[PDB]
Design a protein around this ligand. Sequence first.
Ligand SMILES: CCCCCCCCCCCCCC(=O)SCCNC(=O)CCNC(=O)[C@H](O)C(C)(C)COP(=O)(O)OP(=O)(O)OC[C@H]1O[C@@H](n2cnc3c(N)ncnc32)[C@H](O)[C@@H]1OP(=O)(O)O
Ligand SMILES: Cc1nn(C)c(C)c1Cc1nnc(-c2cc(Cl)ccc2OC2CCNCC2)o1
Ligand SMILES: [Mg+2]
Length: 411
Amino acid sequence: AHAFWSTQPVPQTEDETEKIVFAGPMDEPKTVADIPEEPYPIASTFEWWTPNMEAADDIHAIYELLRDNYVEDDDSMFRFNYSEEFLQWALCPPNYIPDWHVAVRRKADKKLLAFIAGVPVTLRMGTPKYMKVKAQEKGEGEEAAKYDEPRHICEINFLCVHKQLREKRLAPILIKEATRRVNRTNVWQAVYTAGVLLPTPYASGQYFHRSLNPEKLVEIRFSGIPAQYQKFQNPMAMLKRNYQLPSAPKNSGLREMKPSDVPQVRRILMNYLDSFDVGPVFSDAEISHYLLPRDGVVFTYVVENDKKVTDFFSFYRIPSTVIGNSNYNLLNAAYVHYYAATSIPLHQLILDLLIVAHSRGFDVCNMVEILDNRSFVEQLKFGAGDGHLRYYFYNWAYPKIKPSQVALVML
Ligand SMILES: CCCCCCCCCCCCCC(=O)SCCNC(=O)CCNC(=O)[C@H](O)C(C)(C)COP(=O)(O)OP(=O)(O)OC[C@H]1O[C@@H](n2cnc3c(N)ncnc32)[C@H](O)[C@@H]1OP(=O)(O)O
Ligand SMILES: Cc1nn(C)c(C)c1Cc1nnc(-c2cc(Cl)ccc2OC2CCNCC2)o1
Ligand SMILES: [Mg+2]
């Protein structure tokens, strides 16, 4: 049934995942010297290509492939349109490895046909607290804590095959070649997400949406006027009134994050994330890169009281193409990124997120039910969407965990 994922080091079934108790590796311990030095064989009409993320043309090529061929919703109404500036930010974090961005081009015209990206991440991915306490009481704490130390692994995203090339087994060939390039750097684990079911997720979380411009959302059929809104005489006025937001933030200490905030945000974020079972570890340079405001890409606000940053939130932008709508070309979506609250309830901090997003012209705020994102769903008027984001490891045994125990936000 899975001609490719059968040949790979991942759990093969739910309830192998349900069985697993300790974190740890799957494949044979291997060495760099074992890995072929030559690229994986590919048909002679194609060629492997390592884009230069510092070249505007190369970024443009990847931008057009993804604009026309990347992720759609289940009804083919929307497709992500990541910007070139977003792709530059996502694909070139501190100490990125240029060789981990892998593409396939047609040799004759150099047309981009397929792409996959890997970047570094430092991830806590040892045994979950729940399996560790079981282990303690059963005598096995040492084996449980064996892989507690954050690991320098690969995070995979932006897998894409051109629509004209679909179901020709090109995605396996890409994943093989990315794995070879990563393994040649002496890295042996990857983390990735997908909105499809594959063998086998260690966590799954529902999508959630918060309407900011319900007029537009209904016009492009992201949303409907719910049946309940019919035995009111007036549908849309009532819908606007329901989702209306203040014009200005209500926390008085709120301002955009600036470079001098990097150490304190790093500290309050690391203290919050270290509570979850699977989560990233960031250096100052990675906090700067992923959280300092960048126009049209990432937006970050701190609450500063008496010169001390005590809370912050961030969100990132992905516009979606509205596939065949006359009136609207684009859906302008904000996605909740990292945050930390120490002085105010999380609902109060995220309200300010919604207020800034709406003021800056976003149409909806989207998120997955990871981190403590459930604690503000009802009071902030989020709704569950129709789908789940699934979390996976390559070469890592891991128990099934709840999504409220995951702290890795994917872009
Ligand atoms: C140590 C380092 C390791 C690094 C590598 C770690 C692994 C990284 C893994 C990648 C994580 C990516 C994270 C993201 O970016 S998730 C986003 C994925 N991108 C899209 O959804 C964009 C729209 N779709 C496409 O471009 C194509 O449909 C793709 C490229 C998805 C498949 O192309 P196509 O439709 O032309 O099919 P094929 O005949 O060539 O290949 C069929 C095989 O592909 C397996 N397939 C289908 N979808 C996915 C999927 N989303 N992840 C993994 N595998 C997937 C499928 O089960 C089948 O295997 P098997 O069932 O026959 O066994
Ligand atoms: C395309 C498209 N555009 N829109 C607006 C939607 C709801 C889709 C479908 C869709 N596919 N994924 C999501 C998603 C939906 C939500 Cl609510 C939150 C995160 C989502 O995925 C992100 C970005 C890419 N990497 C994983 C995290 O939404
Ligand atoms: Mg294919």
